[PDB]
Design a protein around this ligand. Structure first.
Ligand SMILES: *[C@@H]1O[C@H](CO)[C@@H](O)[C@H](O)[C@H]1NC(C)=O
Ligand SMILES: *[C@@H]1O[C@H](CO)[C@@H](O)[C@H](O)[C@H]1NC(C)=O
Ligand SMILES: *[C@@H]1O[C@H](CO)[C@@H](O)[C@H](O)[C@H]1NC(C)=O
Ligand SMILES: *[C@@H]1O[C@H](CO)[C@@H](O)[C@H](O)[C@H]1NC(C)=O
Ligand SMILES: *[C@@H]1O[C@H](CO)[C@@H](O)[C@H](O)[C@H]1NC(C)=O
Ligand SMILES: *[C@H]1O[C@H](CO)[C@@H](O)[C@H](O)[C@H]1NC(C)=O
Length: 435
């Protein structure tokens, strides 16, 4: 179901509609020109920003799901139609960690990165950081395994030293971490994302609730419970087999149209929680944006948001000339970073009452942007066509045309023009509003 090149391709009428719980699926050529290296161009730098792989529910969500399944089994006097499996379903999902399928997604991502950037990767040991979450570190380790596997199979590789994770950045309300939000006090108190999500859930869940209760006489559900049952479709799928090759029985409880609504609920939560829908959402991505500027320009970091001055000032923890960089992070920070970079500046604020497709949203959705195992590549290339280095952004293989600069038909801008266009991040944006 899942391959190095194309990601997850089984049951796409369901599995591509789980938002940030969808396994990565390649968006090569989807509302986009090819991501192939253009003729007479050579990559000179690449930054990768990768999410962790498919995981179990968080400890708190796992407790909530198990509670619900138990109550359904305690209360139902019959389990009708496609709900029949719920009589004997045994809840055994873990918590927080990667699933085996999620580990393999990250091995695959490391193979794909090597293959795509083979010309550089043959001689380069990437500089790697990970946010301090066990699933994120484990994802970095699995990516490195895949990178090394591919490099070992290439008789043209000259430097095969294994890359280490050189920096693990703590996750704390008081540690400035560009790969995980947490220090912006006002933002952390925001309820906007949850409120938008709750409002949209109240629109679509009642009809599903009524149908589920009809097939489970004796059971009383809430709107929240409907969402839990829908969450279980993704979590059970990515856990129950090593290769996620069998759709969970939870999945067919809901129709394709209902999956489109769930997919949009996820997009809304991310847009209003972490993206431009939140007044301090894109501010969470300023620190990484300034780190990326420093790497692209081979210059010291200029930032007073969520960079750590000690870490960015030491070449051991922040080299300015490493040619390949790979950072491991989470969905929410990645959303903020993509918005801070201006990559979704063609997306209109999402309707809170109506489902809008990724097409109508200029390529934005949670499943297109931050699926499990999501990756972004930020390239600098030197092309015969142009004296100045050109920048290109690929999000899950889709070319995402740059905003703020004189962009070409291939989605690229000249390096200096691109950096000039990031004036908002370069100034620190509205970070002061945090406090
Ligand atoms: C910055 O990093 C240093 C070195 O790891 C750490 O001791 C310090 O607590 C960090 N400060 C903040 C605010 O992140
Ligand atoms: C949720 O719906 C209520 C009542 O319809 C509305 O007044 C409120 O502003 C909505 N909240 C958000 C965050 O959209
Ligand atoms: C099961 O029954 C108990 C006792 O009446 C009730 O409080 C609970 O809400 C029910 N749960 C479900 C999911 O039906
Ligand atoms: C962490 O960032 C805050 C501002 O967001 C700043 O007060 C602090 O000095 C920074 N600390 C370090 C070590 O970068
Ligand atoms: C993206 O749009 C926001 C809101 O208009 C603006 O503040 C920001 O400067 C834009 N970014 C780029 C890179 O053009
Ligand atoms: C490039 O120079 C940096 C300082 O910016 C230093 O850490 C190192 O010598 C080089 N980076 C490597 C080896 O990746």
């Amino acid at each position: 179901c899942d391959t190095v090149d194309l990601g997850y391709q089984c049951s796409p009428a369901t599995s591509h509609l789980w938002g940030q719980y969808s396994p990565f699926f390649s968006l090569e050529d989807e509302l986009s020109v090819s991501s192939k290296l253009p003729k007479d161009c050579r990559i000179t730098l690449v930054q990768v920003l990768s999410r962790h792989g498919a995981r179990y529910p968080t400890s708190s969500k796992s407790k909530k799901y198990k509670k619900l399944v138990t109550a359904i089994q305690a209360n139902a006097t019959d389990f009708k139609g496609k709900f029949a499996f719920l009589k004997t379903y045994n809840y055994t999902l873990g918590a927080d960690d990667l699933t085996p399928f999620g580990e393999q997604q990250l091995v695959n991502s490391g193979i794909k990165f090597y293959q795509r950037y083979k010309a550089l990767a043959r001689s380069v040991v990437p500089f790697i950081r990970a946010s301090g979450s066990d699933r994120v570190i484990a994802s970095g380790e699995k990516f490195i395994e895949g990178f090394q596997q591919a490099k070992l199979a290439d008789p043209g590789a000259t430097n095969r030293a294994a890359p280490a994770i050189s920096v693990i950045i703590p996750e704390s309300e008081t540690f400035n971490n560009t790969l995980d939000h947490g220090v912006c006090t006002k933002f952390e108190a925001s309820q906007l994302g949850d409120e938008v999500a709750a409002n949209f859930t109240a629109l679509f869940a009642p009809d599903i609730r009524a149908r589920a209760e009809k097939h489970l006489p004796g059971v009383t559900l809430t709107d929240e419970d409907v969402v839990s049952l829908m969450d279980m479709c993704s979590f059970d799928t990515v856990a129950r087999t090593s290769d996620a090759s069998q759709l969970s029985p939870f999945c067919q409880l809901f129709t394709h149209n209902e999956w489109k609504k769930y997919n949009y609920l996820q997009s809304l939560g991310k847009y209003y929680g972490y993206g431009a829908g939140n007044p301090l959402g894109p501010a969470q991505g300023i620190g990484f944006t300034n780190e990326l500027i420093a790497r692209l320009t081979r210059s010291p970091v200029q930032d007073h948001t969520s960079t750590n001055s000690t870490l960015v000032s030491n070449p051991a923890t922040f080299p300015l000339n490493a040619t390949m960089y790979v950072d491991f992070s989470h969905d929410n920070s990645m959303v903020s970073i993509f918005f801070a970079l201006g990559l979704y500046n063609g997306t209109e604020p999402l309707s809170r009452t109506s489902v809008e497709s990724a097409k109508e949203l200029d390529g934005y959705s949670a499943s297109w942007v931050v699926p499990f195992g999501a990756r972004a590549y930020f390239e600098t290339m030197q092309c015969k066509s142009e004296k100045e280095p050109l920048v290109r952004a690929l999000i899950n293989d889709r070319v995402v045309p740059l905003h703020g600069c004189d962009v070409d038909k291939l989605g690229r801008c000249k390096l200096n023009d691109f950096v000039k266009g990031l004036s908002w991040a370069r100034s620190g944006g509205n970070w002061g509003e945090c406090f």
